[PDB]
Amino acid sequence: KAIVQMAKILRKELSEEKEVIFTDVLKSQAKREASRGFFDILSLATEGCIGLSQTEAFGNIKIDAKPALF
Amino acid sequence: GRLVGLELSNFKSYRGVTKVGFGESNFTSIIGPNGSGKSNMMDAISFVLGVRSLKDLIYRGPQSAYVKAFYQKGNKLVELMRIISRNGDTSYKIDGKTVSYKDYSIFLENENILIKAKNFLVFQGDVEQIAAQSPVELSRMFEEVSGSIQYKKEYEELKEKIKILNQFLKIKKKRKELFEKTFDYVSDHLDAIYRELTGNASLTIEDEDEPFNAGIKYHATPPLKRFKDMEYLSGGEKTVAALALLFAINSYQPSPFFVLDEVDAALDITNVQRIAAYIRRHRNPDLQFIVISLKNTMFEKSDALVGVYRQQQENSSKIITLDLSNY
Ligand SMILES: Nc1ncnc2c1ncn2[C@@H]1O[C@H](COP(=O)(O)OP(=O)(O)OP(O)(O)=S)[C@@H](O)[C@H]1O
Numbered sequence: 145k146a147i148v149q150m151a152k153i154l155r156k157e158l159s160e161e162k163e164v165i166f167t168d169v170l171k172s173q174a175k176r177e178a179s180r181g182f183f184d185i186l187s188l189a190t191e192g193c194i195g196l197s198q199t200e201a202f203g204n205i206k207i208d209a210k211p212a213l214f
Numbered sequence: 215g216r217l218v219g220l221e222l223s224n225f226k227s228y229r230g231v232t233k234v235g236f237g238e239s240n241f242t243s244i245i246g247p248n249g250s251g252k253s254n255m256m257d258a259i260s261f262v263l264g265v266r267s268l269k270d271l272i273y274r275g276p277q278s279a280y281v282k283a284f285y286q287k288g289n290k291l292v293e294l295m296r297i298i299s300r301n302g303d304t305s306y307k308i309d310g311k312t313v314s315y316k317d318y319s320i321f322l323e324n325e326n327i328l329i330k331a332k333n334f335l336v337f338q339g340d341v342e343q344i345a346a347q348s349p350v351e352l353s354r355m356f357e358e359v360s361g362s363i364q365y366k367k368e369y370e371e372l373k374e375k376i377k378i379l380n381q382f383l384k385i386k387k388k389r390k391e392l393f394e395k396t397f398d399y400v401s402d403h404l405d406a407i408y409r410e411l412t413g414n415a416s417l418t419i420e421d422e423d424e425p426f427n428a429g430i431k432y433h434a435t436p437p438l439k440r441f442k443d444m445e446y447l448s449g450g451e452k453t454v455a456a457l458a459l460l461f462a463i464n465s466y467q468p469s470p471f472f473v474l475d476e477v478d479a480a481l482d483i484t485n486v487q488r489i490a491a492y493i494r495r496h497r498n499p500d501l502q503f504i505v506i507s508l509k510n511t512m513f514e515k516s517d518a519l520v521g522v523y524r525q526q527q528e529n530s531s532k533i534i535t536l537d538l539s540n541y
Pocket residue numbers: 225226227228246247248249250251252253254255270271272273274275338508
């Protein structure tokens with residue numbers, strides 16, 4: 145289950161900062177991986193553990209934490 | 215042409231205003247968890263295009279909902295819009311100016327989007343049927359895709375009456391030639407496509423003189439095996455046979471894009487790979503593939519991704535996009 149490995153890296157980083165960019169979270173793990181992580185966020189946002197926001201078409205995805213992430 | 219993007223307004227689970235940009239992707243996968251609202255997104259595409267496979271659309275905690283599609287017709291970017299009021303009254307618009315469903319249907323019918331045949335939209339859970347349908351049904355579809363179905367009424371009227379016979383031969387010659395104009399092409403390209411998705415497949419007319427008055431027997435034989443009746447094929451086998459027919463039939467008057475829901479649900483990891491390979495290998499500015507898959511094997515190979523997620527507080531689906539052509 146990778147939705148936990150991703151929840152972990154985010155649960156950490158979101159305790160040392162308010163905002164986190166998707167590209168960065170991927171960064172700290174080293175294309176099949178980008179998509180894999182992308183789904184993980186979407187999953188997490190749906191469960192309610194995370195917040196998502198994007199400004200432009202294919203711009204940056206801002207990830208913020210929610211009380212449930214913990 | 216290409217489907218550049220969409221704009222939904224209280225469409226289904228898409229409360230408020232939602233913008234979806236496909237960018238220059240010619241292979242986009244709409245991914246997200248169960249219940250997030252991916253199929254609703256396809257329901258929106260089929261909705262703007264006409265298609266009747268109503269107030270039950272419109273979001274539910276507004277009085278009307280609308281969907282806009284930004285089609286790329288040459289240099290210009292056309293805006294196709296459709297609205298539904300809570301009473302059921304729909305309205306169509308093109309580039310902002312209201313129009314009739316006839317003018318609308320034609321615009322699309324001219325860009326090869328036959329909302330009649332729906333042969334470019336495979337809804338969730340329906341892929342295997344394209345193969346498993348009955349010969350009579352397959353025939354009906356051919357009649358529907360070629361256009362030969364039009365002469366169906368008149369042909370029946372004049373058929374019953376029995377110099378009134380020349381009016382019957384004249385029309386028979388059209389229903390038949392129009393039907394063959396499509397069938398022949400499809401038949402000729404069917405086997406190559408099936409083999410690529412692998413193999414051997416074929417179509418067979420039953421009533422040779424009047425093919426439209428009988429079944430069309432579809433035969434597919436997965437590789438290392440040897441049978442022909444769809445009855446013997448397994449779920450994954452039936453799926454692949456279906457995707458081949460689906461693509462063969464569209465090869466005649468190529469729709470500009472496909473919207474496939476969970477077509478890969480019954481597939482091997484090997485087979486998911488072949489479909490993904492095929493899609494990637496054939497996608498291009500003229501043939502765009504919008505796929506909804508839960509499988510990484512599938513969406514990994516995409517050009518871009520449209521991620522759908524829920525936002526429980528706000529009780530609405532949401533969208534975020536990612537371009538995979540970089541990774
Ligand atoms: N009129 C509506 N108003 C608000 N929410 C709606 C409406 N119609 C449907 N929904 C919601 O949308 C969900 C269905 O979304 P779909 O588009 O089927 O999701 P999905 O991502 O396709 O899921 P699968 O097929 O299981 S992978 C349901 O769970 C509903 O709660």
